[PDB]
Structure formats: structure tokens, C-alpha cells
Design a protein around this ligand. Sequence first.
Ligand SMILES: Nc1nc2c(ncn2[C@@H]2O[C@H](COP(=O)(O)OP(=O)(O)OP(=O)(O)O)[C@@H](O)[C@H]2O)c(=O)[nH]1
Lengths: 250, 303
Amino acid sequence: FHYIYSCDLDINVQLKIGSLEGKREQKSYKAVLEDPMLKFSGLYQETCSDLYVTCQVFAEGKPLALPVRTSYKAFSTRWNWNEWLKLPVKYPDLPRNAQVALTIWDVYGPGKAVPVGGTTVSLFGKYGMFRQGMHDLKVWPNVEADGSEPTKTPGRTQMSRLAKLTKAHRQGHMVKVDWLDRLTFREIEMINESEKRSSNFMYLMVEFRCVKCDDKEYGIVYYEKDELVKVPDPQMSMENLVESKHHKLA
Amino acid sequence: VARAKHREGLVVVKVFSYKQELEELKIRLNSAQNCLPFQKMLFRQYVRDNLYDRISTRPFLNNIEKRWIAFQILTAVDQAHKSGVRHGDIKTENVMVTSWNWVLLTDFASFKPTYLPEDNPADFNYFFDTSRRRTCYIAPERFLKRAMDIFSAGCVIAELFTEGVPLFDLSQLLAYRNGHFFPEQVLNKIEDHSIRELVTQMIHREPDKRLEAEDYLKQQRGNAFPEIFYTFLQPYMAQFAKETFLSADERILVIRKDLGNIIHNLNGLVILVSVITSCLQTLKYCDSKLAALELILHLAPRL
Ligand SMILES: Nc1nc2c(ncn2[C@@H]2O[C@H](COP(=O)(O)OP(=O)(O)OP(=O)(O)O)[C@@H](O)[C@H]2O)c(=O)[nH]1
């Protein structure tokens, strides 16, 4: 088990926006009847809309930097961004409970945008490790990605059983057999496909920097570098800052 | 006298049976949180400030803080006498004010005599005259008892509220004892009429009139010393008078946790800030610094 601390790793955190896989619900006729602007909305167009996914890092319910958009990319039959966003924040400046909000947007009319979803996935998961691989976050509908702690739009909650076991397989903790796992893995793929299909919500896929300039084998871990006398005195010998303030002023 | 250093602290050492008496003060005044006798050539802890220096520093004791210090002086007077201890020689140079306004009464004079021959000032000059400011607060009857001290405490309070001006020098005190002198100018210098009456009552020429420090506290409960001192600050501030929160991190965390109750009662906030900052200038872990900053932001609108 090899790892590099978050404090030492001084680069920009990068995130890949994959494909928003799901089905998008529409309104009734009366809604467009009362508000004709819905006809020209993005959702009411026959082809997939040109959505763009903003991203902002939060911490303790406080925004940590400006959001980052996705470069314009046309869509014909699917939402496949496959873009490597660069985040303003760096690894040593991410607090423990940092969480990345990701909001989808769509046109509503001249000079207006309307959120078409929202997801919030923690960066430092259990055991204080930076989440890696290809995680498929959930999509809460018609709500901007909420950054408050605890989040009101969480990303990730027998599918759970197989999620844990697959991890233990590739971390070396499992019995060794070739054909059996070669078939079982396709089985899990089909099971996950069915589970995703059944779920009514959308699901936005996302990937972290599993492969970087350094060996992929390493992982990131949260880290930081911080009877003569009985009655305590915690400032016995320091500078009198008020004295200095008065001396400097006049 | 000279300062020294210690493995994990600082010390003050003086060079000149009695040893047994000093340890008696160590036990008795271990319960008395606002006292500090000879911990051991005599050795003890070096405190941040003295009363005189603290008066003459850029942070300037307000009326509220001076009243609190008078309250704690009286509290130390009680705690001393209850256990069976009498200071004997109280003065501004022996009331050490820690960085968080925790008055400590130190240098319990058990070696000084009791009676001074009024025709020979040699004893005063050799024993009591150390600062050489010529201020004398020895009890007129002496020329021990709680009476002999309450007088000294009242004189110290009057001096404290007069910004270092003394109530008596040796000549003024001797004239006062004779019955042909009364410092109406110093008593008129006192900031508040309430503590002026307090000094006047504490300094009755004839000892029998002087009350106990407990009664003087009791009368002042209404206006002289606000009730908040008796109920809230006396117990709550006593937590930091021991080794439970030696680390500034723990102090800041505890104060943050209890901020809900503290704001409920407390104003005494001046003492709270004098507590927090001493923790500020030494914090080590980042969480402690952020908590201290949050505390500072919380207290700011109230100040
Ligand atoms: N600021 C500060 N000064 C101290 C401290 N301890 C001792 N001193 C100094 O030591 C001097 C002691 O003077 P006094 O208070 O009259 O005591 P003394 O001179 O030993 O004579 P006694 O009345 O018998 O105690 C004071 O003037 C202080 O300046 C301390 O902890 N802090």
C-alpha cells in the first residue's frame, strides 16, 4: 500500500464530465398553454439539448472558489462531454469535508438559464481517501446542486453488496480464479445496467484523475502538518501586539 | 530576588519550622483558586503582571475590570482567612494579575513582625519598604487579624482606582492614625462613590468597626459588584485556574462549546476577551485557530 499525502501533492484537482445517462420528464399541455416560453425552452426541442455542467467546490457550507463551465460541445443523440475540467482548488487546500457540487443547465429563453438537475458527491470519502475511478453520481431533478453540510442533494447512497465485493477483488482480497470471475464480471455489468434502467432518476457519470503524471498505483490520503509551575499561562513570553499597535500609531 | 527558568515553566527565587508553614499554605490555598503562596531560598511561579505594572500598561484596566479585581481581592481575603491564613502585608506589588485577569494574592508575609514602634521607622524601612514609593498601608492598630488586612485591601482598592496615586505615604498614614488627618483628596479621586464608601468603611480608624470581607461583599452585591460576579464568573472562570486546560487549543474549544451559556449570563465580556487572546497567541493546530477566529467574530458585535 503506497500513497501520497494531499498536502504534498501540489497540483490542480481535475474532474472528467462523462455522460448524463437517463430519461428526462416533461410537463403537461396546460403548462405550455399558460407559459408559452416553454415551447422555445431547450427541453421541448426534439434533439438532445446543449447542456453545460458547472462545478464548484464547497466546504462547511461555504463556496471555496468560482464555478467552472464546460467548453461548448454539440450533441446529436447523447450527452457525451468527455471533457477534463480543471478546478481552481488544489489538493493541499481541500478541507476534510470538501464536496463538489455539479449543476446541469439548459436554455429557458433569451438571457435566462434553468437548472435541469443537481448532484453533490464528497471528495474525501470514508477513511480519508480521495475518491478515484469512475463514479456515477445521482441527479436530483430541478434543484440546483446544494452545497450545504449536510447536503440535501446527495450523490451516492443487492447492488451494494456487489459494489463492496468488486472493490475487494481488485485490492487483492479475494479468491483467485480466471474463468469464474471473467463470467461473473459480465454478470455484475448486466445487473448494474438493469438497476440503472429501473431507477427513475438520471445518473451523471464522472471520473477522477486515477491516471496522472505519477504512477497510477498511488492513492491520495487526507493529511496535514498541524511542580514549580502550577497555574497555567499560555502566553507567558510573547509579543505585546497591542503595545506594538499603539507604538506604531503616533 | 531574581527570575530564573524551569524545564516547563518560569520561576522567581528569593535569597535571604518556617518551611512547614509554607507547605501549609500550599495545601490550604490549593482550594483557594485566587491565591498563590510560596510553592517551595524561596521559589514560586512567575506571574505575567503585577498590579502596578498592569495599571501602567497599554491595555488599561477599565472601571469594570478594576471592580472585578477588587471583588477577587476580597475573595482572596476570605479564602485566606477562612483557612486560617492572614497576609500581614498587602500592597499593589503583591497582587499578581495573570494574562487572563485572574487575580492571585502572593507573598504571604509570615516572617514580618506584628507591631511597629511608632518612634522608630527602622523596622518599616528594612522589612516593608521595598518598592520605595513610600506608600504604607500597615494597619493603624499595629503601631494578626482579618481587620489588619481588610484595611490594607481597602487602601489597595483606593490606590487602584486612583491610577497609582497612594492613599497614604508614611507621614500621611501616621497623621491619619493620630486623629489629625484625613485624605479627602484621594477619597475624592475615587472613580465611583460606591467604592469610595467601600474604602471609607474598610478603613475605620478603630479596628472594632471593620467588618468581615464576606459582609463587605454581601452589601455590594447590588450595585458595587454586579451579581454576575457572584453567580457566573466566579465558578466558570475557576476552570482555567487549574491544569485542566493547559493547552490553548483546549481552552479555545471549551470556550467555543460554552458560548451559548456564556452569552446567556454575561457586562463581563471584557474578562472573556482577556481569556481568549492569551489562547490566541499560542495556538498550534489549525482547527484551534479557526475556532478562535469564529469566537472573535461571535464576540465582536457584543463589544
Ligand atoms: N511583573 C511582575 N513583577 C514581579 C513578579 N514577581 C515579583 N515581581 C517584582 O518583585 C517586586 C517585589 O516587591 P514586593 O511586592 O514589595 O515584595 P518584596 O519586595 O519581596 O517585599 P514583600 O512585601 O515582603 O513581599 C515587585 O515590585 C515586582 O516588580 C511577577 O510575577 N510579575
